[PDB]
Amino acid sequence: QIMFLSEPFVRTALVKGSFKTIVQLPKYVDLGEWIALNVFEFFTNLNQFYGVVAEYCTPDNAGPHTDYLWLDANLPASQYIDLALTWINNKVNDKNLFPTKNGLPFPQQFSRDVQRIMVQMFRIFAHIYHHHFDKIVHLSLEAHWNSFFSHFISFAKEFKIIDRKEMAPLLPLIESFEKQGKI
C-alpha cells in the first residue's frame, strides 16, 4: 500500500522561493541556537500536521520495501509515531539539551541527539507520505505539506544533519523537488 505523490500533486504552494533565506544560518548567529530553534519548530508543526491524519492511521507501520522498526533491542504505524512524537517532545523540552536560561550552553551530546531527532521526524514524514497522504489531498493540504517537506529537506541538506542514504523511501520525491528542494 504505497501512494503516488509524483502525480500533478507535485504542486507546492507557499514556496515562491527555494527556502535558502529562511534555512541559511544567519550571519554571526550562534550555530547551536539556530539548529535548536528550527528543530523545535519542525517538531511543533509536524506533530500538528500528524494530528489531522492521526484518525486514519490505525494498524494499516511504514512504507513499501523499507519498513521502519522501533522494536528490536530494549509496532503499528500509530504506535511508533505516537511514541516518537512524545519522545521528541521530552527531548525538545529537556533543559539539559535545550536550555532556556541565557548563560547555559548546549552540551556535547547536543549535535548527536539533533541527528537522532531529525531522522525520527523524517520517519514520521515517511508513513504520512506513504500511507496517509491521500487524505491530505482530500483536505487540500498538499500545498502546505509539500512546502513543509521541501523546507524540512532543504534544512537537512544545508547543515548535513541527515545522510543521503536515509532519504531512500522519499528520494524520488526529493529528486522531483529539485527546483524547490535546494541544490
Residues making contact with another protein (CB under 8 A): 4, 6-9, 14, 17, 21-22, 26-30, 33-34, 36-37, 40-41, 44-45, 48-49, 51-53, 55-56, 98-100, 102, 134-135, 137-141, 144, 147-148, 151
SS3 10: coil
Q: Among another protein, Zn ion, none, what binds residue 77 when CB lies within 5 to 8 Å by partner kind? A: Zn ion
Q: Among Zn ion, another protein, none, what binds residue 75 when CB lies within 5 to 8 Å by partner kind? A: none
Q: How far is the CB of 141 from another protein (least distance, A)?
A: 6
**Following DSSP, what letter does each residue of 117-183 receive, concatenated?**
HHHHHHHHHHHHHHHSHHHHHHTT-HHHHHHHHHHHHHHHHHTT-S-TGGG-TTHHHHHHTTTTS--
Q: How far is the CB of 90 from another protein (least distance, A)?
A: 14
* Beta carbons of 114 and 161 less than 8 angstroms apart: yes
Q: How far is the CB of 89 from Zn ion (least distance, A)?
A: 20
